[PDB]
Design an enzyme around this catalytic site. Structure first.
Site, mmCIF file in Angstrom:
data_model
loop_
_atom_site.group_PDB
_atom_site.id
_atom_site.type_symbol
_atom_site.label_atom_id
_atom_site.label_comp_id
_atom_site.label_asym_id
_atom_site.label_seq_id
_atom_site.Cartn_x
_atom_site.Cartn_y
_atom_site.Cartn_z
ATOM 1 N N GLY A 176 0.809 -1.218 0.000
ATOM 2 C CA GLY A 176 0.000 0.000 0.000
ATOM 3 C C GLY A 176 0.835 1.257 0.000
ATOM 4 O O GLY A 176 2.054 1.174 0.084
ATOM 5 N N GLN A 177 0.210 2.437 -0.087
ATOM 6 C CA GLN A 177 0.941 3.699 -0.102
ATOM 7 C C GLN A 177 1.883 3.888 1.064
ATOM 8 O O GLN A 177 3.015 4.288 0.820
ATOM 9 C CB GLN A 177 0.004 4.900 -0.220
ATOM 10 C CG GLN A 177 0.759 6.218 -0.278
ATOM 11 C CD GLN A 177 -0.162 7.376 -0.279
ATOM 12 O OE1 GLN A 177 -0.978 7.522 -1.186
ATOM 13 N NE2 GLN A 177 -0.051 8.206 0.733
ATOM 14 N N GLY A 201 -3.160 -1.736 2.862
ATOM 15 C CA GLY A 201 -2.265 -1.835 4.010
ATOM 16 C C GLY A 201 -2.795 -2.734 5.106
ATOM 17 O O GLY A 201 -2.031 -3.456 5.723
ATOM 18 N N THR A 261 -6.791 9.804 6.358
ATOM 19 C CA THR A 261 -7.654 10.141 5.213
ATOM 20 C C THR A 261 -8.980 9.346 5.188
ATOM 21 O O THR A 261 -9.729 9.444 4.194
ATOM 22 C CB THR A 261 -6.885 9.989 3.872
ATOM 23 O OG1 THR A 261 -5.979 8.864 3.922
ATOM 24 C CG2 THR A 261 -6.142 11.264 3.481
ATOM 25 N N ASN A 283 8.679 9.563 7.097
ATOM 26 C CA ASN A 283 9.270 8.329 6.612
ATOM 27 C C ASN A 283 10.763 8.288 6.742
ATOM 28 O O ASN A 283 11.291 7.208 6.979
ATOM 29 C CB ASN A 283 8.832 8.019 5.181
ATOM 30 C CG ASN A 283 7.355 7.916 5.006
ATOM 31 O OD1 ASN A 283 6.604 7.753 5.969
ATOM 32 N ND2 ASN A 283 6.906 8.016 3.768
ATOM 33 N N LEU A 336 18.746 -12.172 14.882
ATOM 34 C CA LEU A 336 17.295 -12.228 14.891
ATOM 35 C C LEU A 336 16.687 -13.216 15.889
ATOM 36 O O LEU A 336 15.766 -12.827 16.600
ATOM 37 C CB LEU A 336 16.765 -12.487 13.490
ATOM 38 C CG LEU A 336 15.298 -12.209 13.299
ATOM 39 C CD1 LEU A 336 15.002 -10.747 13.422
ATOM 40 C CD2 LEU A 336 14.831 -12.727 11.964
ATOM 41 N N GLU A 377 18.007 -14.531 18.763
ATOM 42 C CA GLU A 377 18.223 -14.065 20.126
ATOM 43 C C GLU A 377 17.402 -12.810 20.410
ATOM 44 O O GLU A 377 16.791 -12.686 21.463
ATOM 45 C CB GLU A 377 19.693 -13.775 20.337
ATOM 46 C CG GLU A 377 20.001 -13.455 21.776
ATOM 47 C CD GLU A 377 21.461 -13.178 22.039
ATOM 48 O OE1 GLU A 377 22.306 -13.602 21.216
ATOM 49 O OE2 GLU A 377 21.761 -12.561 23.088
HETATM 50 N N1 LIG Z 1 3.983 7.540 7.990
HETATM 51 C C1 LIG Z 1 3.275 7.405 6.867
HETATM 52 N N2 LIG Z 1 1.959 7.210 6.940
HETATM 53 C C2 LIG Z 1 1.366 7.158 5.725
HETATM 54 C C3 LIG Z 1 1.955 7.280 4.491
HETATM 55 N N3 LIG Z 1 1.006 7.186 3.487
HETATM 56 C C4 LIG Z 1 -0.122 6.998 4.122
HETATM 57 N N4 LIG Z 1 0.017 6.962 5.483
HETATM 58 C C5 LIG Z 1 -1.057 6.662 6.466
HETATM 59 O O1 LIG Z 1 -1.651 5.424 6.108
HETATM 60 C C6 LIG Z 1 -3.085 5.477 6.319
HETATM 61 C C7 LIG Z 1 -3.818 5.331 5.005
HETATM 62 O O2 LIG Z 1 -3.388 4.115 4.375
HETATM 63 P P1 LIG Z 1 -2.657 4.023 2.937
HETATM 64 O O3 LIG Z 1 -1.353 3.327 3.045
HETATM 65 O O4 LIG Z 1 -2.661 5.412 2.288
HETATM 66 O O5 LIG Z 1 -3.593 3.136 2.009
HETATM 67 P P2 LIG Z 1 -3.396 1.833 1.118
HETATM 68 O O6 LIG Z 1 -2.659 0.745 1.787
HETATM 69 O O7 LIG Z 1 -2.743 2.264 -0.179
HETATM 70 O O8 LIG Z 1 -4.943 1.488 0.945
HETATM 71 P P3 LIG Z 1 -6.003 1.789 -0.204
HETATM 72 O O9 LIG Z 1 -5.559 3.086 -0.827
HETATM 73 O O10 LIG Z 1 -7.313 1.943 0.503
HETATM 74 O O11 LIG Z 1 -5.974 0.632 -1.150
HETATM 75 C C8 LIG Z 1 -3.333 6.800 7.051
HETATM 76 O O12 LIG Z 1 -3.301 6.625 8.468
HETATM 77 C C9 LIG Z 1 -2.201 7.678 6.512
HETATM 78 O O13 LIG Z 1 -1.957 8.758 7.394
HETATM 79 C C10 LIG Z 1 3.388 7.459 4.429
HETATM 80 O O14 LIG Z 1 4.092 7.552 3.420
HETATM 81 N N5 LIG Z 1 3.959 7.512 5.686
HETATM 82 MG MG LIG Z 2 -3.652 3.718 -1.540
#
Ligand SMILES: Nc1nc2c(ncn2[C@@H]2O[C@H](COP(=O)(O)OP(=O)(O)OP(=O)(O)O)[C@@H](O)[C@H]2O)c(=O)[nH]1
Ligand SMILES: [Mg+2]
Ligand SMILES: Nc1nc2c(ncn2[C@@H]2O[C@H](COP(=O)(O)OP(=O)(O)O)[C@@H](O)[C@H]2O)c(=O)[nH]1
Lengths: 50, 430, 160, 432, 217
Positions: free
Chosen positions: D10-11, D140, D173, D222, D246, D248
Site C-alpha cells: 500500500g501507499q 495496508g 484520510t 518516513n 534475529l 536471540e
Molecule cells: N507515515 C506514513 N503514513 C502514511 C503514508 N502514506 C499513508 N500513510 C497513512 O496510512 C493510512 C492510510 O493508508 P494508505 O497506506 O494510504 O492506504 P493503502 O494501503 O494504499 O490502501 P487503499 O488506498 O485503501 O488501497 C493513514 O493513516 C495515513 O496517514 C506514508 O508515506 N507515511
Molecule cells: Mg492507496
C-alpha cells in the site's frame, strides 16, 4: 431572441395571488374542465450490499 | 480509479452540465475548441478523469448529452463551450417528456434509452479504470427526472460495481409553475434512495433565496441560479480533478461520507457567495470557515442547526495558511460539538487545493451529510400528499402504463428516509 | 415561427450534428413548412441526417414525403431504411404497401420488423406477413381470417 | 548468510520502503543503479548481486492501484529494483479492508506470491520477511492480512516481522481507519512474530518538536521512520561481534504468543539546522529512551509493566559505557518488570553510527539507540483504537461497505472479541 | 509460593498457548524442582514458543534430568528452541551435552552457533577444543568472539597458535577476546609466541605481545 443566462424564472407562488392550495385548486379545476408497469420496491438497493 | 463518465439529461441537466464544463475547462486550461492553453502541469495531472485525450492535443469531455427534446441539444451546441463536446455523444429524440416522469421513465424515454446506453458503453469500454458515473438532472420534469432515473437504473444493472453519483436539482414553487413537480420529485427520490451512492441536493428554493436575499438580485434568472450550481460543482469535484490524498475518487469519497446506504443525500455549500457580474477583497481563513458552514451558504434549503452532521467534507482553495485552516476546522467542531455526531470519530475531513476558482484568490466548498436534509424531503412530501390525497393529475402518469401503487412505494420510501435521518439525529453514543 | 425557419436554414449547416439536430427539431415542431427542406435532407451525404429527416417526415405526416420515403427504403444504411419504413406506416398512405412488402425480405433484422408493424398500421400485406421480428408480423395480422391457421415470444400475440 | 525479504504494501508501506532503501543504499555505499563504487559484505542479506556488481534489493512493493509505485518506476531508484518486484493493480481497496483482503486482493495475491517465490529461490537460507504497511488503508490492512495468511502456508518456519502505521487523525484520510486497524490486527495476530507500530502522531510530534518542522510531510515522517527501521535491521546488514542476531533478539523481546507489539523509543533526533550540536554520550541517549517524548507510539510505560527490554546501540558505543548507563537505569522506580519475568536489558551494539541522508532533516550523530520494550503500556494504543471502533460499530456505521465486499458482520465481531482478549492479555500480565 | 508453583504446573496443560508459555517462564524464574518433569513434557509441546520457554526454564532450574530431553531439543525445527536448549545445556554443565553442542557449532542460525560456543566454554571440556578452533574461522564475528573466549575459558594449549592468528582478525572485539584468551592460557607456549610477535608482528598483535612480556618474565 434571449441569451440562456437571461432565461427567466416563471414562479408558481403569485405574491398577493397564490401560496397554499390557491395555485393547486386553481389547477385541479382547469384540468377537470378538459398492462400496469412493474416498479422499484423499498429496500431493493440495500440488498445489493450483501 | 481514473475515468468518470458524465451524463446530462433533460433541460436542467444539460444547462447545469454545460455550465460545469465551461467552469472546469477554464480551471484545467482547456479553451472552447478543446485545445490546452494553460500554464501549470497541475491542470493536466488529473485531466484524464473528466476528459479524453484526442489527437491535436485536444481534450474532449467524457460527457453524454441526453434529451428527448432536440432544442436542448441545439442550445448546448451553440453555447460558449458547445464545440468541445463529441458530436456522436449528443443522444436525442424528436419528442419530449411533457414534464411527466412516466413519459421519461416508461414510454418516450424508454424508446431512447438503448441509444444512450450504446454511447455510455463506448465511453466505458474505452476506460483504463472506470470510477463510475456522474449524472446532472432536475427532479421536477420528465426527462432529467424520469429518463435520468431510468438511465441510473439501467446503468446500475450493467455496471453494478461502479459508483453512481448525481447532481439532482430539487423543485421549488418559487422557481417553477408546473403543478406536478412534487410527483416527479418523489418518484425520483425513491429511485435515488435505492440506486445512487452519493446525491448532491441542489435545491432551487435555496438557489432562489441566495439570489434574492443575500446576492440582492430582485429578479433572478436561470443563469443566476446556475452560477451557484457551477460554483458548487467545481468545488465538490476539486478533489477528483487535482492531486490529493483525501476523497480523491468517487469510491473513497462515498466510503468517508456515507455511513448508511440510504443516507447518501448531501447538502453542499460554498464561500464566498458571488454573482455573475461582480468582482470580489479576499476572505480570511476564519471568514471562509464561518461562512461555508452558514445556512445562508447552503445549496439545500435546510437549517443545519435543525440536525446533526454525520460526516463533513471541507475543501479550501487557494494560497492560505494551513495552520489557520486546521485551527479554524478544530474550532468550528469544538464550539459547535452538539451539531456533529459523537459516534463517528473524526467525521470532518479537510482538503486543500492550491488552485483557487476563477475570479477568487481564496474559497471554500462544503459537502455535509446532515440529518437536517429531512427538511427538504419533508417539504416535497407535504406538496406530494396535498396532490396525492386528491388523486390530482394521476391520469397523466396512469395513462402511460404506470401503476398507481408506485406513487405509494415512492411516498413510503421518502417518508422512511425522513424517519431514518431523525433516528440518527436522536442517536446517542452512551 | 422564427424557430421553424432557423432550423430550416440549419439543414444546410457544415456540421453534421447541427443538421441532424435541425431535422429532429423540425419533426418535434411538426410544422408543414419543413416538409420540402426535410425531403431534400433525405438525400444528405451523412446517414444520421437522412435518418433524422426520415423520422421527422413521419412525425409531420404529410403525404408529399411518401415517394421520397419509398426511395429511402432502398438506402444502403439500415437506420435510414428503418426510419423511412416507420414513417411510411405513420403516414398510412396506400402507395407504401408494395414497397413495405419488399422490405419484409430485408437482410437486416431491424428493418424487416419495422416494415411489419407499419403494414399493420396501414389487405395486400396479409400473404407476405404470413410468410423476434415474427411477433411484429403476428401483431400486424391481428391489426388487419386468412391468418388463423398460420398461428398453429411468438405465443403472447396469438389471440386477436 | 540468512536473507531477509522486505514486502512493502500500500501507499504507506511503499513510501516507507522508499525511505528505507534510500537509507540502506547510503549505509552500504550502493548507488541508485545498484553499483557499489567502493570485505565486510554482510549487506548481502538484504541485497542480491547480479552480473558485474549490480546489487538489487530483496524487496517486493505491492499496491492495488498504480500511482505510488509508478513514481518508483520513474524516479531516482527506477534502476534499483527489477521491474517485476514492483507489482500494481488498477482499482485500489477504497480504504476498505474487505476490498484489500477479499474482492480486490484475491485477484493479485497469486502474482504477488509468485514474485516472492522468485526472490525466495535466490536465498541460500531465508531467515524471514519484514512487512511494511499502514493499519488505516484498505490495502495496508486487507492485502497484508491476506498475504500474511498465505505466507504462513507457503513459508511457515520463516519469521514475519511488521512495521505498521498506527493511525493518527492529523494525517488520517478515512473515517473507517479504526475498523481496518482491528480487522487487520485480528487476522495477522497468529501469522506474525513481532510488530513494531509507529503512531503517526508520535512521529508528527517528534518532527515538530525536535526538527522544528511546523507541518511535517510524509517524506519527513518516513525518513525518521527509516532511521528506526535501520537501527532494528542493522544487525542483519552489518558484521559485528557485539550485535544481537534475529533469533536471540526475537526470543528475548517477543517470547510469548499474541503480546508481540514492542514499544520502540529512539534517540537522538537532532535538527540539521542546529548551528552547533554537542554530541550526546551513551548515558545521555540511554536516559532519553525512558523519556516519553522519544516514543514511536503515544502511551505511558511508567504506569505499565515490562516483560522484556532491548537496547540496540549503533556507532561509537563502548560496552563499559552501556553497562554503566544500565546500572543508572536499574535504580529507576518507573521501570517495573512483571514478577514472573527476568529483570534485565538485552544489549546489541552495531559499529556504524546512523547515516546522514543528504537533504534530510537530521544532523550527524556519533552514536544512537533504539530501545524496544515489551511493555503492557502498549495496550493503551489498542484501547484508543477499540474505543473508536466501538462508537461506530454500535451503530453499524460504514459496515455495509465491508459486507458488500465479501465480508460478514460476524468477522467484525470476531476481530473485536479477539482485541478484547488482547487488552485482557496485557491486563493479566501487568497485574500487581 | 508452593501452591503458586502447582498453579503454573497445571497451566502447562492450558488450552491457551500464551498461558502455557507464561507458565513455563514463571516456573524457570521460581526455579522449583517439582516443575522439572512437567517442563520436560512441555519440551514436546505443539507450539515452539512453549517448547522454547520450557527449555529456558530447565537451564534456570539446572536439574540434570533435563540433559537428555534438552539434547533432543537441540535438533528442533525452530531456532529459538535450539538456542534456548543450547544455553540451558551450558548452564547445567553436564558433560553429556559436549558432543551435541559440538554439532550445534555448525548450525545455520548464528544465535545457535554463538550460544553453543559459550556453552562449551562453560562446560570446559577438552573435546570442544578442535571444533572451537574451527569456529575461530567463522563468517560471523560474534561466533569467532565466543569461540576465542571459550578457548580461553577451556585453557587448552592446542588453541595457542590459532588464537595468535585471531589477533589479526578484522573485528576489534575478536582481536581483544583472542588476546584475553591467550593471557588466560598462559605458560611458555604463549610467552615464546609473544616473544616472536614482539619483533616480527605488527599492529595490535605486536602491541599485545609487547604488553604480555612487560608483566610476564
Ligand atoms: N507515515 C506514513 N503514513 C502514511 C503514508 N502514506 C499513508 N500513510 C497513512 O496510512 C493510512 C492510510 O493508508 P494508505 O497506506 O494510504 O492506504 P493503502 O494501503 O494504499 O490502501 P487503499 O488506498 O485503501 O488501497 C493513514 O493513516 C495515513 O496517514 C506514508 O508515506 N507515511
Ligand atoms: Mg492507496
Ligand atoms: N437550476 C436550474 N433549474 C432548472 C433549469 N432548467 C430547468 N430547471 C428546473 O427543472 C425542473 C423541471 O424542468 P426540466 O429540467 O426543464 O425538465 P426536463 O427537460 O423534462 O428534464 C423545474 O423545477 C425547473 O425549475 C436550469 O437551467 N437550472
Amino acid at each position: 431572441m434571449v441569451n440562456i443566462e437571461e432565461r427567466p424564472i416563471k414562479a408558481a407562488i403569485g405574491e398577493r395571488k397564490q401560496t397554499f392550495e390557491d395555485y393547486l385548486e386553481e389547477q385541479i379545476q382547469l384540468e377537470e374542465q378538459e398492462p400496469k408497469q412493474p416498479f422499484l420496491k423499498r429496500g431493493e438497493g440495500l440488498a445489493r450490499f450483501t | 480509479m481514473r475515468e468518470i463518465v458524465h451524463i446530462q439529461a433533460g433541460q436542467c441537466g444539460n444547462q447545469i452540465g454545460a455550465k460545469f464544463w465551461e467552469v472546469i475547462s477554464d480551471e484545467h486550461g482547456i479553451d472552447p475548441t478543446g485545445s490546452y492553453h494553460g500554464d501549470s502541469d497541475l491542470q493536466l495531472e488529473r485531466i484524464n478523469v473528466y476528459y479524453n485525450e484526442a489527437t491535436g492535443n485536444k481534450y474532449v469531455p467524457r460527457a453524454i448529452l441526453v434529451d428527448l427534446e432536440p432544442g436542448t441539444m441545439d442550445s448546448v451546441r451553440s453555447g460558449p463551450f458547445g464545440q468541445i463536446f463529441r458530436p456522436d455523444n449528443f443522444v436525442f429524440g424528436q419528442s419530449g417528456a411533457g414534464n411527466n416522469w412516466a413519459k421519461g421513465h416508461y414510454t418516450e424515454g424508454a424508446e431512447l434509452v438503448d441509444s444512450v446506453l450504446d454511447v455510455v458503453r463506448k465511453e466505458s469500454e474505452s476506460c483504463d479504470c472506470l470510477q463510475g458515473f456522474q449524472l446532472t438532472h432536475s427532479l421536477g420534469g420528465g426527462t432529467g427526472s424520469g429518463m435520468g432515473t431510468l438511465l441510473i437504473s439501467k446503468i446500475r444493472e450493467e455496471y453494478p460495481d461502479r459508483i453512481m453519483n448525481t447532481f439532482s436539482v430539487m423543485p421549488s414553487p418559487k422557481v417553477s409553475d408546473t403543478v406536478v413537480e412534487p410527483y416527479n420529485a418523489t418518484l425520483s427520490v425513491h429511485q435515488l434512495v435505492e440506486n445512487t451512492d452519493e446525491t448532491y441536493c441542489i435545491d432551487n428554493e435555496a438557489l432562489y433565496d441566495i439570489c434574492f436575499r443575500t446576492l440582492k438580485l430582485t429578479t433572478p434568472t436561470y443563469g443566476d441560479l446556475n452560477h451557484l450550481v457551477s460554483a458548487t460543482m467545481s468545488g465538490v469535484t476539486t478533489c477528483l480533478r487535482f492531486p490529493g490524498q483525501l476523497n480523491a475518487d468517487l469510491r473513497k469519497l462515498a466510503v468517508n461520507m456515507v455511513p448508511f446506504p440510504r443516507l447518501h443525500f448531501f447538502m453542499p455549500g460554498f464561500a464566498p457567495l458571488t454573482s455573475r457580474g461582480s468582482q470580489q477583497r479576499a476572505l480570511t481563513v476564519p471568514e471562509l470557515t464561518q461562512q461555508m458552514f452558514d445556512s445562508k451558504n447552503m445549496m439545500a434549503a435546510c437549517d443545519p442547526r435543525h440536525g446533526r452532521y454525520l460526516t463533513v467534507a471541507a475543501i479550501f482553495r487557494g494560497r492560505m495558511s494551513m495552520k489557520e485552516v486546521d485551527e479554524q476546522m478544530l474550532n468550528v467542531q469544538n464550539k459547535n460539538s452538539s451539531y456533529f455526531v459523537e459516534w463517528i470519530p473524526n467525521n470532518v475531513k479537510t482538503a486543500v487545493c492550491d488552485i483557487p476558482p476563477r475570479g477568487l484568490k481564496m474559497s471554500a466548498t462544503f459537502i455535509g451529510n446532515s440529518t437536517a436534509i429531512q427538511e427538504l424531503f419533508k417539504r416535497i412530501s407535504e406538496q406530494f400528499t396535498a396532490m396525492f390525497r386528491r388523486k390530482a393529475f394521476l391520469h397523466w402518469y396512469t395513462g402511460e402504463g404506470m401503476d398507481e401503487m408506485e406513487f405509494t412505494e415512492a411516498e413510503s420510501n421518502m417518508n422512511d428516509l425522513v424517519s431514518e435521518y431523525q433516528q440518527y439525529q436522536d442517536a446517542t453514543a452512551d | 415561427p422564427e424557430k421553424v425557419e432557423m432550423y430550416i436554414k440549419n439543414l444546410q449547416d457544415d456540421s453534421t450534428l447541427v443538421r441532424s439536430i435541425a431535422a429532429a427539431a423540425l419533426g418535434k415542431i411538426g410544422d408543414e413548412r419543413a416538409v420540402e427542406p426535410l425531403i431534400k435532407a433525405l438525400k444528405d451525404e451523412d446517414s444520421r441526417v437522412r435518418a433524422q429527416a426520415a423520422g421527422a417526415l413521419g412525425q409531420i405526416g404529410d403525404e408529399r414525403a411518401v415517394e421520397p420515403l419509398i426511395k429511402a427504403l432502398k438506402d444502403e444504411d439500415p437506420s435510414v431504411r428503418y426510419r423511412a419504413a416507420e414513417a411510411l406506416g405513420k403516414i398510412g398512405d396506400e402507395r407504401a404497401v408494395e414497397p413495405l412488402i419488399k422490405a419484409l425480405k430485408d437482410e437486416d433484422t431491424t428493418v424487416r420488423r419495422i416494415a411489419a408493424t407499419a403494414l399493420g398500421k396501414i389487405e395486400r400485406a396479409v400473404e407476405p406477413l404470413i410468410k423476434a421480428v415474427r411477433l411484429t408480423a403476428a401483431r400486424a395480422l391481428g391489426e388487419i381470417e386468412r391468418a388463423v391457421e398460420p398461428l398453429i415470444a411468438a405465443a403472447q400475440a396469438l389471440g386477436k | 548468510m540468512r536473507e531477509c525479504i522486505s514486502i512493502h504494501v500500500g501507499q504507506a508501506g511503499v513510501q516507507i520502503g522508499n525511505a528505507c532503501w534510500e537509507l540502506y543504499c547510503l549505509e552500504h555505499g550502493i548507488q541508485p543503479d545498484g553499483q557499489m563504487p567502493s570485505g565486510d559484505d554482510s549487506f548481502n542479506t538484504f541485497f542480491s548481486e547480479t552480473g558485474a556488481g549490480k546489487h538489487v534489493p530483496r524487496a517486493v512493493f505491492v499496491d492495488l492501484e498504480p500511482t505510488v509505485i509508478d513514481e518508483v518506476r520513474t524516479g531516482t531508484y527506477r534502476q534499483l529494483f527489477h521491474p517485476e518486484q514492483l507489482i500494481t493493480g488498477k482499482e485500489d481497496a477504497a480504504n476498505n479492508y474487505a476490498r484489500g483482503h477479499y474482492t480486490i486482493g484475491k485477484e493479485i495475491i497469486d502474482l504477488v506470491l509468485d514474485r516472492i517465490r522468485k526472490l525466495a529461490d535466490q536465498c541460500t537460507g531465508l531467515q524471514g520477511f519484514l512487512v511494511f504497511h499502514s493499519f488505516g488503508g484498505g490495502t495496508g490492512s486487507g492485502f497484508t492480512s491476506l498475504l500474511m495468511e498465505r505466507l504462513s502456508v507457503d513459508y511457515g518456519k520463516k519469521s514475519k516481522l511488521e512495521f505498521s502505521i498506527y493511525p493518527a487523525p492529523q494525517v488520517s484520510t478515512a473515517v473507517v481507519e479504526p475498523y481496518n486497524s482491528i480487522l487487520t490486527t485480528h487476522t495477522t495476530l497468529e501469522h506474525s512474530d513481532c510488530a513494531f507500530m509507529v503512531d503517526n502522531e508520535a512521529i508528527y510530534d517528534i518532527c515538530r518538536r525536535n526538527l522544528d518542522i511546523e507541518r511535517p510531510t510524509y517524506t519527513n515522517l518516513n525518513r525518521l521512520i527509516s532511521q528506526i527501521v535501520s537501527s532494528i535491521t542493522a544487525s542483519l546488514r552489518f558484521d559485528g561481534a557485539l550485535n544481537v542476531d534475529l533469533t536471540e533478539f526475537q526470543t528475548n523481546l517477543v517470547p510469548y504468543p499474541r503480546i508481540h507489539f514492542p514499544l520502540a523509543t529512539y534517540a537522538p533526533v537532532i535538527s540539521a539546522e542546529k548551528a552547533y550540536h554537542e554530541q550526546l554520550s551513551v548515558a545521555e541517549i540511554t536516559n532519553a529512551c525512558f523519556e516519553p517524548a522519544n516514543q514511536m507510539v503515544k502511551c505511558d510505560p511508567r504506569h505499565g509493566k515490562y516483560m522484556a527490554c532491548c537496547l540496540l546501540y549503533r556507532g561509537d558505543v563502548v560496552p563499559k559505557d552501556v553497562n554503566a548507563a544500565i546500572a543508572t537505569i536499574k535504580t529507576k522506580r518507573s521501570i517495573q518488570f512483571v514478577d514472573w519475568c527476568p529483570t534485565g536489558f538485552k544489549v546489541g551494539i552495531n559499529y556504524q553510527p546512523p547515516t546522514v541522508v543528504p537533504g534530510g532533516d537530521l544532523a550527524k550523530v556519533q552514536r544512537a539507540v533504539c530501545m524496544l520494550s515489551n511493555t503492557t503500556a502498549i495496550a493503551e494504543a489498542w484501547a484508543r483504537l477499540d474505543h473508536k471502533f466501538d462508537l461506530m460499530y454500535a451503530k453499524r456505521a460504514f459496515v455495509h461497505w465491508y459486507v458488500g465486499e465479501g465480508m460478514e458482520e460476524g468477522e467484525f465481531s470476531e476481530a473485536r472479541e479477539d482485541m478484547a482478549a488482547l487488552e485482557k492479555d496485557y491486563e493479566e500480565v501487568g497485574v500487581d
